[PDB]
Design an enzyme around this catalytic site. Structure first.
Site, PDB file in Angstrom:
ATOM      1  N   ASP A 122       0.816  -1.201   0.000  1.00 54.95           N
ATOM      2  CA  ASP A 122       0.000   0.000   0.000  1.00 54.95           C
ATOM      3  C   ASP A 122       0.860   1.267   0.000  1.00 54.95           C
ATOM      4  O   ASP A 122       1.338   1.697   1.054  1.00 54.95           O
ATOM      5  CB  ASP A 122      -0.899  -0.001   1.245  1.00 54.95           C
ATOM      6  CG  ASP A 122      -1.819   1.198   1.297  1.00 54.95           C
ATOM      7  OD1 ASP A 122      -1.898   1.903   0.276  1.00 54.95           O
ATOM      8  OD2 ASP A 122      -2.477   1.400   2.346  1.00 54.95           O
ATOM      9  N   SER A 151      -0.646  15.503 -12.140  1.00 56.47           N
ATOM     10  CA  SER A 151      -0.881  15.110 -13.514  1.00 56.47           C
ATOM     11  C   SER A 151      -1.106  16.357 -14.356  1.00 56.47           C
ATOM     12  O   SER A 151      -1.640  17.357 -13.882  1.00 56.47           O
ATOM     13  CB  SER A 151      -2.099  14.176 -13.589  1.00 56.47           C
ATOM     14  OG  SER A 151      -2.488  13.904 -14.918  1.00 56.47           O
TER      15      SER A 151
END
Length: 330
Positions: free
Chosen positions: A35, A199
């Site tokens: 994770d 992004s």
């Protein structure tokens, strides 16, 4: 040193991925959910409330000659889906795919919430976010990666998750045969303890690319892709009959649909998520309404590039002095 381990979807929907991990001496192999959105290595154990164990493999520290109670240490964690676990702490030897850390904090669960009990395939979590998020008190502990880093050939790990298929986590090296083209690296902020990056935009299907900054985290422990409501609405508007369902808890779509791809930007590079990756199947057994793999982050407070996005790429988690993230197509 290096390590390399295969990671395997827990079910036919790629709801999560498990990777075998050796703990203790003699080894006890548990299947953990790696994770990158948390920083605790915790396991089902001989200390876990019996009614809360249902099929998981447990760590039994009393059977490990290298286990030592970390005196006075406790831990307690809550995750983004409302699940939680807590307990006490041992140090022990932990190996992943041939890479060994001695003295790793292994957090033994005394309590786990129902979502963990109900998932027989996940024996615990192995956190790979920054150690500043580790919950052990009163002395915060380091992640497996943080402990291994100085010994690694290169201070990196990579995630290569499969779509409905196994994949790989590598530590200490970049497998140049595992991706196509080049890896594009992008800046990371560690201020919130996550692999947080920006992004450069998105496209829906064969549509034009929209240049827009989307701050979010690379989180292998989250199943879906959570993005701003504007972006998600633009995606689902291209699927006939798709709608946001408050009763179901997100966007659903007719199971008869063919889903468009979704592209996200990494610098000037582009990662394409095929439409099929966005299908999470019937909302309930036998239903013709299917659950979407792209959902709104509104009310999460952060955008999350979860498995839906990451499995479309070869992802480098670069833990050099100034961390960065790399993405390649594959």
């Amino acid at each position: 040193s290096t390590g390399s381990a295969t990671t395997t979807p827990i079910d036919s929907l790629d709801d999560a991925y498990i990777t075998p991990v050796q703990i203790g001496t003699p080894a006890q192999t548990l299947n953990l959910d790696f994770d990158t959105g948390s920083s605790d290595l915790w396991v089902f154990s001989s200390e876990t409330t019996a009614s809360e164990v249902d099929g998981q493999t447990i760590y039994t520290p009393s059977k490990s000659t290298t286990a030592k109670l970390l005196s006075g240490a406790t831990w307690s964690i809550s995750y983004g889906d409302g699940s939680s676990s807590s307990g006490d702490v041992y140090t022990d030897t932990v190996s992943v795919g041939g890479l060994t850390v001695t003295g790793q904090a292994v957090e033994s669960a005394k309590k786990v919430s129902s979502s963990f009990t109900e998932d027989s395939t996940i024996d615990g979590l192995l956190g790979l976010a920054f150690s500043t998020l580790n919950t052990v008190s009163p002395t915060q502990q380091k992640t497996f990666f943080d402990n291994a880093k100085a010994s690694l050939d290169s201070p990196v790990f990579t995630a290569d998750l499969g779509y409905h298929a196994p994949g790989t986590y590598n530590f200490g090296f970049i497998d140049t045969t595992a991706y196509t083209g080049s890896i594009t690296y992008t800046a990371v902020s560690t201020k919130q303890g996550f692999w947080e990056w920006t992004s450069t935009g998105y496209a829906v299907g064969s549509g034009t690319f929209k240049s827009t900054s989307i701050d979010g985290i690379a989180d292998t422990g989250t199943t879906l892709l959570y993005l701003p409501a504007t972006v998600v609405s633009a995606y689902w508007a291209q699927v006939s009959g798709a709608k946001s369902s408050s009763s179901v808890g997100g966007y659903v779509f007719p199971c008869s649909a063919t889903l468009p791809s979704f592209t996200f930007g990494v610098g000037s590079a582009r990662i394409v998520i095929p439409g099929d990756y966005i299908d999470f199947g019937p909302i309930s057994t036998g239903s013709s309404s299917c659950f979407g793999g792209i959902q709104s982050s509104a009310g999460i407070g952060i955008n999350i590039f979860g498995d839906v996005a990451l499995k479309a790429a070869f992802v480098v988690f670069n833990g050099a002095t100034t961390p960065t993230l790399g993405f390649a197509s594959k």
